[PDB]
Amino acid sequence: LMTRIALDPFVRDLDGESAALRAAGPLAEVELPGGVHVYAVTHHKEARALLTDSRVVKDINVWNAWQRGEIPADWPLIGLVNPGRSMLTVDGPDHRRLRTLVAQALTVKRVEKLRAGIEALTNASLERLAALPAGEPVDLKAEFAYPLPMNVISELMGVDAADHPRLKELFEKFFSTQTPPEEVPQMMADLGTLFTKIVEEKKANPGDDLTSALIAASEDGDHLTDEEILNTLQLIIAAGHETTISLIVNVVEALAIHPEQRKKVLSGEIPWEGVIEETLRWNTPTSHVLIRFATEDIEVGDKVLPKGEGLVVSFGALGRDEEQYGPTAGDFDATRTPNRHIAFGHGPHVCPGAALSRLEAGIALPALYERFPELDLAVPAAELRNKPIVTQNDLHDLPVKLGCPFG
Numbered sequence: 542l543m544t545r546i547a548l549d550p551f552v553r554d555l556d557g558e559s560a561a562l563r564a565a566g567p568l569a570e571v572e573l574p575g576g577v578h579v580y581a582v583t584h585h586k587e588a589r590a591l592l593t594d595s596r597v598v599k600d601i602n603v604w605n606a607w608q609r610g611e612i613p614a615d616w617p618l619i620g621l622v623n624p625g626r627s628m629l630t631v632d633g634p635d636h637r638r639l640r641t642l643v644a645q646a647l648t649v650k651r652v653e654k655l656r657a658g659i660e661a662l663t664n665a666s667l668e669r670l671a672a673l674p675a676g677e678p679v680d681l682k683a684e685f686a687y688p689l690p691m692n693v694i695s696e697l698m699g700v701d702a703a704d705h706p707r708l709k710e711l712f713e714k715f716f717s718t719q720t721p722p723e724e725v726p727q728m729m730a731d732l733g734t735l736f737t738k739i740v741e742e743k744k745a746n747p748g749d750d751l752t753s754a755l756i757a758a759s760e761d762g763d764h765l766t767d768e769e770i771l772n773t774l775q776l777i778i779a780a781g782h783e784t785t786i787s788l789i790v791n792v793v794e795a796l797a798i799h800p801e802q803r804k805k806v807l808s809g810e811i812p813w814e815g816v817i818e819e820t821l822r823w824n825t826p827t828s829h830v831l832i833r834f835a836t837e838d839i840e841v842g843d844k845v846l847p848k849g850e851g852l853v854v855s856f857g858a859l860g861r862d863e864e865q866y867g868p869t870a871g872d873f874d875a876t877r878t879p880n881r882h883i884a885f886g887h888g889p890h891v892c893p894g895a896a897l898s899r900l901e902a903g904i905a906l907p908a909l910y911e912r913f914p915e916l917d918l919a920v921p922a923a924e925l926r927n928k929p930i931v932t933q934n935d936l937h938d939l940p941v942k943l944g945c946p947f948g
């Protein structure tokens with residue numbers, strides 16, 4: 542086993558961390574912030590295997606370190622490691638019960654119906670740009686990427702829009718490695734009190750949206766506790782806004798660095814669905830997914846994940862496995878045709894909202910470059926920088942000069 546790798550909480554060099562984990566694969570020793578030792582799978586072939594192995598589980602009571610009360614309650618990463626009972630944290634027969642009404646609501650068919658809505662919100666956001674003074678840089682993150690998927694997923698769950706500025710300011714702190722440990726459990730307090738408030742707004746006045754579809758259904762021949770709903774709602778609002786925002790940003794960043802490919806994208810030669818997929822492989826929004834545990838020793842290539850130890854899937858590292866995609870695994874090629882990446886997961890927990898975000902991004906990007914065909918970065922590509930979020934590949938801002946609307 543190669544030298545232990547300590548995930549930098551300031552994300553000063555993601556591309557090199559990823560390469561190191563690549564080198565230390567298939568299974569690498571890793572240290573999470575606060576000195577917590579866990580292992581990490583960093584190869585494509587082997588990550589598929591562990592994700593479909595029933596010996597690898599989400600029950601934290603299987604974690605040696607947690608049995609032995611070694612994980613501070615004040616830990617910054619506790620939010621991710623132990624978020625409570627939901628689809629995310631259980632397995633096998635118990636899992637299917639919490640997933641099913643959510644997996645049905647986000648199929649290609651049942652999400653096609655939201656398109657009208659997404660075109661609406663995009664075509665608006667575009668109006669608000671250009672409404673800004675031309676010539677002067679704009680943060681494409683704050684003005685376009687952030688609000689769009691939030692609005693969407695708010696609509697989907699029927700969340701009141703007057704809680705947006707408050708939800709923004711809370712998720713900011715949840716993800717930051719530089720949020721002060723004494724501040725943790727009044728942030729989590731207020732998330733809980735925020736989500737409980739709007740769940741009761743829904744019981745009082747049930748709408749057609751998915752929050753209410755969970756409420757009515759539980760009462761008859763299937764499951765769903767008062768807590769399981771509340772936890773399953775946080776999961777859907779968090780996962781479904783964070784990741785997709787980053788996808789959009791990252792697509793825009795990729796086309797900037799690769800302008801020959803951008804030229805062909807804008808002309809139609811390369812279809813947009815190939816750019817979005819390649820961006821997911823090459824520069825996934827989710828660098829690391831937290832937390833599984835071996836029920837017993839598992840062979841992993843020529844190493845062993847010892848029974849009781851934590852496991853991380855390093856999607857960022859494995860997104861450029863040359864064993865999987867050949868010698869060009871390190872480069873953005875939007876035409877890379879057979880492209881069976883796992884940015885969305887594998888086995889039982891694989892993303893149920895893949896089709897939603899593929900849809901949001903496949904509407905919003907071509908809309909933006911139809912309106913602003915000259916749009917390029919306002920800063921050199923190397924000055925762009927990751928926010929301090931160890932699991933996520935999030936940029937701080939994306940300043941661009943729009944360059945006059947040919948819409």
Ligand code: HEM
Binds near residue numbers: 640781785832885
């Ligand atoms: C670019 C966008 C996205 C990426 C890269 C992404 C990635 C992932 C990954 C890797 C997982 C697996 C978690 C694990 O195996 O431990 C996952 C699970 C999940 N994602 Fe996504 N996701 C995206 C968008 C969304 C959206 C839009 C929604 C909801 C509308 C969503 C909801 C979920 C849920 C509910 C789970 C848990 C499913 C389960 O545990 O069975 N995600 N996502």
Ligand SMILES: C[C@]12CC[C@H]3[C@@H](CCC4=CC(=O)CC[C@@]43C)[C@@H]1CC[C@@H]2O
Binds near residue numbers: 775776779780831
């Ligand atoms: C844990 C969590 C649900 C699961 C989310 C997590 C944000 C990070 C994230 C990104 C993914 O790619 C999968 C879903 C996860 C792992 C969310 C933060 C709050 C919410 O309860």
